[PDB]
Structure formats: C-alpha cells, structure tokens
Amino acid sequence: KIHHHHHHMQTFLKGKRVGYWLSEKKIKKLNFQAFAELCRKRGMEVVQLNLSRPIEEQGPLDVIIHKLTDVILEADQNDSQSLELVHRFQEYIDAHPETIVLDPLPAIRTLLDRSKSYELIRKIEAYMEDDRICSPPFMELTSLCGDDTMRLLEKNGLTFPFICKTRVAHGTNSHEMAIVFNQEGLNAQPPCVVQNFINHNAVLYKVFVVGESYTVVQRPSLKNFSDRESIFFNSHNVSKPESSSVLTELDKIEGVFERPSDEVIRELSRALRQALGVSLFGIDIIINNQTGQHAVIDINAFPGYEGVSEFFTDLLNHIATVLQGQSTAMAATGDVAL
C-alpha cells in the first residue's frame, strides 16, 4: 500500500558528491552529521561547503543542499560579507548547471517575502480551483494607519480580526505579530502584511515537505476569537512543539473540526514544488472552522522538521530522485500540469 519505492534509484548514489551549506546552529539542530554518515553508506561523498573560498576547489558537486535564507536576507540588507558569499555561490551555480541546487535561490527569495509568498499561494490556488482550499484575504501595508486605512482594508477584503506580520519572513523580529480586532486597534507597522484571522480550533498542521514525501505534524496554534486591545505575540511562543500559553488554549471546539486532506496536501505540494522549484520546505495549514477549507498561512524554506523522524531517509530519497530526474532529463515544460 506504499507503492513508491527508492531501492533502484538509490543504487545510483554511489560516487556522487553532495555539498551543503548550513549555519552551525542549523547543523546542530538537524544533527546534520548523522545524515552525512547515512549518505556515505550509500557510497556518497558529503562535504560542508566553505563559501569564503572558491567553490571550484570544493567540487565537483552533483548536488548542493543549503539553507542560505539568512545570508540572502543579510545580503539584501547590504551586508558586505553576505553579498560576497551569495555572489560566490551564484557565480558557481551559473558556471555549473549540472549541479543540482536544493533549493534554487529565486524560490528562497520568494519565501523570504510574505507578500510575495501569499500572492503566489493565492494564484496557485486560483489556478487549481479546489473548493477545499481557501486563500485568506491579505494585503501589504506600507504606511502607518491614517484616515483612509479602513477603506483600503475593506476594499481588499480584510476584516476584523486580522493578523499583522512582517513582510520579511525570516530573521530578527520576523516572528513578531499582532492581532487587530477593531478600528481602535489599527496603531498595530509597515512594511507588514495583514491577513484575515481564520478560527481553526487552535490546531496547526505543519506539512513538512521533502520533495516527493511529506509528513504532517500537529502543533499548537492560536485559539478561536470585540472592543479589546490588539494582541502582540511572537510566533515561536505559539506553534513550537512545547508552546503553551493562553493564546493557544482553545476555549471549546467550534464549527468544522477535521484533519487536512492528503489529497489536498498532495496537490498543494506538487503545485508549490513545480511553480517555485522548491523541495525542502514547510506549509502551515489550518482548517477553517466555518467552511472546513484548508488555508495555507505560511510557507517556509528548509524548516526544522521537528517531529519528522523520517527526515534523513526522505532527504536521501529526494537526492536519489533528483539525480534520477537529471540523469533522464526529466525537465518540466510549459505551465504547472495539475
């Protein structure tokens, strides 16, 4: 009843070379050393890349796995060292189209921007036209509230309550959010993205995607919800494995309370991977308690995968798959085929 296997494509891993770039912090959290040992047993060479040195000397490389998200963000903020690292990486990539990059920098750049990510999700959803999926209205706000704010929100389908998030999707302060409940609450900061709050019975379904495989991990999440003051919170107090606070304590189950559909997750995963070219990412899905629809409220490059015990195996399987796809010239053409 598992019909997809990898034994045959794994045979081709012997002799392949995988470079990786990950922060020391992420290497520790993932225990990336254990993955590197797994690859050797299949006859792969794994090597940590040093982006301060020419990359040519470090190759040849068949695959590069990275999480350069934060370096890219710092390069965006004109950090000279980070700019140098990114340029050196890009130079290499450009010179070596045979090197498979997990994942392409254009996708990483999209995932660093909530406004861009949400618009991509919205368009993908409009293209799929599946009634089991809803795209919460959202918009980017680039000025402090004023006299026209209410009309602007209304015109774009924003309703109270809505959540305010930073436009930059990663790094310092990127997880500081606010829930705005009324007009008085509008003093809650550009550039931010506002997005309609969806009651979802305080259960978050983190879909952790590793190319062709995913694992759904339930997490705590904001409770259902008014002249009340806006709420300011930091999202790592909310939806981490051990998160526990009044913000996540559901008063009672209300409306539709169902687990996500694997059919739906599969179509979302395929569409996002095919459109963006990502493979190592997470989709945060909540179930709208008024419609039972799936709402994708966050998409993250190369997340923590806490609670995904099969990560290294899945990752090795994905590496085998991309090498197989490359070997047989399995290039996508045209638009995303639904």
Ligand SMILES: Nc1ncnc2c1ncn2[C@@H]1O[C@H](COP(=O)(O)OP(=O)(O)O)[C@@H](O)[C@H]1O
């Ligand atoms: N539109 C929304 N409606 C209801 N809850 C939301 C919404 N967006 C985010 N959340 C809640 O806030 C948490 C953090 O939001 P998310 O967009 O995942 O930010 P982050 O990038 O910081 O993880 C989510 O895990 C979920 O609990």
Ligand SMILES: [Mn+2]
């Ligand atoms: Mn999230």
Ligand SMILES: [Mn+2]
């Ligand atoms: Mn996120």
